[PDB]
Amino acid sequence: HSDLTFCEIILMEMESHDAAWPFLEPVNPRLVSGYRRIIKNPMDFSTMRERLLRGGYTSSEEFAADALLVFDNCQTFNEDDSEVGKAGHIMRRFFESRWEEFY
Template sequence: MTTRQKESSAPCHARFSGEGASSAFSPSKRRRMVTRNQPDLTFCEIILMEMEAHADAWPFLEPVNPRLVLGYRRIVKHPMDFLTMRERLLQGGYCSCEEFAADAHLVFDNCQLFNEDTSEVGLAGHAMRRFFESRWAEFYQDKDQ
């Protein structure tokens, strides 16, 4: 059995290491590998690109640095951000769109847990949640037709 076969037999969430996105495959090749087996994940990639380009995405583009944000690790037990989501998506770490959506919700839930609603980051989190929910609803509306 080759390494690649071993990886594909593992549960999707177990295949994602969370440690950087470097791989023997180029990003485009990794992307094709993911979307070939999970066509719905193409939408996840599209919505993630849209979220990353959104004006209010700045607090969520990379993991929070706990050295710069005191108390973050004490309050937020399961950190999540768009870069980690992108790495997981490219590495085939999502088995379904629902797993992807759960991570997106985790980003916004963590933001709401740690930040005041009226703070700059809190407002950005609410705007990004609305954007994600809107695009997600459009996807499922189109899927049902």
């Protein structure tokens, strides 16, 4: 239980983060040219929220994979000095930091 209880804590903390704005909702491929072709497994905080709420995470490890996928996607599609890339680096370092000072 404590495993999934922390997942809620961190997801909430990511959702409300200043740098979270690129990752709150699925990327809209109609608005982002090339996104469909380049990113095979899209992921975002609202998708993780839906699954978490509907109980669909077996372990804290499955949750971490989705979180890391968000930031791997970010780094694959965006330049590191792009506005989205900069936000993703802040978010990625925030996640790894929060996650580790518990596990």
